Design a protein around this ligand. Structure first.
Ligand SMILES: C[C@H](CCCC(C)(C)O)[C@H]1CC[C@@H]2C(/C=C/C3=C[C@@H](O)[C@@H](CCCO)[C@H](O)C3)=CCC[C@@]21C
Length: 255
């Protein structure tokens, strides 16, 4: 029987708002990047945990890039229909625990399968596995992060699907420390129902109806990458003088 309800006026308005919020908080020209502390790539190739931790040569650049992105995510979240109805305490819980996951999601826009890099664009602002190891991370995080980016690219999401998946990621009732889980779940359900309906309505063949389960599985993968990131950030934080190379926002959000 397979019903395909039309998008309601409200679901249409939710999608419009989320598209606008994303266009206002994601610059696809990367024009701010010249403001970051500059990328430095030392001869590593080894490629040597000792040398990498000794220098952390790409960390000031990539920490500035991630701090800037956290600011853009705070901005995007504040525009999600319902998010402002939450207590400021739940807003912050949700932002701090989703921040790294939304950055991984939104970075898929600059990611290219041409050479498996995040291309912002350019030459100086092209980031590879080797650049991420020069910021103190290891293959345990980087390799599955690359797998994740390829997996997501190949979903070929509509922009409507991409912005809804980010909103659903942020408003998750199962984050540690949330207080009004039912309200967050209500907001999420409204977003998830919008996404489900959108996919049925708008996505060819179909049924690549199955697309919705694939997107939910990405949200599960993101939780595992978040835990690996936390482990590695802890290690990074033990490197003497590391805090200089980070930013106050990054320090707070991650520890
Ligand atoms: C795991 C790591 C975060 C490391 C953070 C640290 C050092 C704090 O632990 C990686 C996650 C992705 C990140 C990355 C590129 C990210 C982005 C590029 C553009 O698409 C961005 C700007 C768009 C304009 O708003 C988007 O926000 C994110 C490349 C190389 C690996 C990472 C540095």
């Amino acid at each position: 029987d397979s019903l395909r309800p039309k998008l309601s006026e409200e679901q249409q308005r939710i999608i419009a708002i989320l598209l606008d919020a994303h266009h206002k908080t994601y610059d696809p020209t990367y024009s701010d990047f010249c403001q970051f502390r500059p990328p430095v790539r030392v001869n590593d190739g080894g490629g040597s945990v000792t040398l990498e931790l000794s220098q952390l040569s790409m960390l000031p650049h990539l920490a500035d890039l991630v701090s800037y992105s956290i600011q853009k995510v705070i901005g995007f979240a504040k525009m999600i229909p319902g998010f402002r109805d939450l207590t400021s305490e739940d807003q912050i819980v949700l932002l701090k625990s989703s921040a790294i996951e939304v950055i991984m999601l939104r970075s898929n826009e600059s990611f290219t399968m041409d050479d498996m890099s995040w291309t912002c664009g350019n030459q100086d602002y092209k980031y590879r596995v080797s650049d991420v190891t020069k910021a103190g991370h290891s293959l345990e995080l980087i390799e599955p992060l690359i797998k994740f980016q390829v997996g997501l690219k190949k979903l070929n999401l509509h922009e409507e699907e991409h912005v809804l998946l980010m909103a659903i990621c942020i408003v998750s009732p199962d984050r540690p420390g949330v207080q009004d889980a039912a309200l967050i779940e209500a907001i999420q359900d409204r977003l998830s129902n919008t996404l489900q309906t959108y996919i049925r309505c708008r996505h060819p063949p179909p049924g690549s109806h199955l697309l919705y389960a694939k997107m939910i599985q990405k949200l599960a993968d993101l939780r595992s990458l978040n835990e690996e990131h936390s482990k590695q950030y802890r290690c990074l934080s033990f490197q003497p003088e590391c805090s200089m190379k980070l930013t106050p926002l990054v320090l707070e959000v991650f520890g």
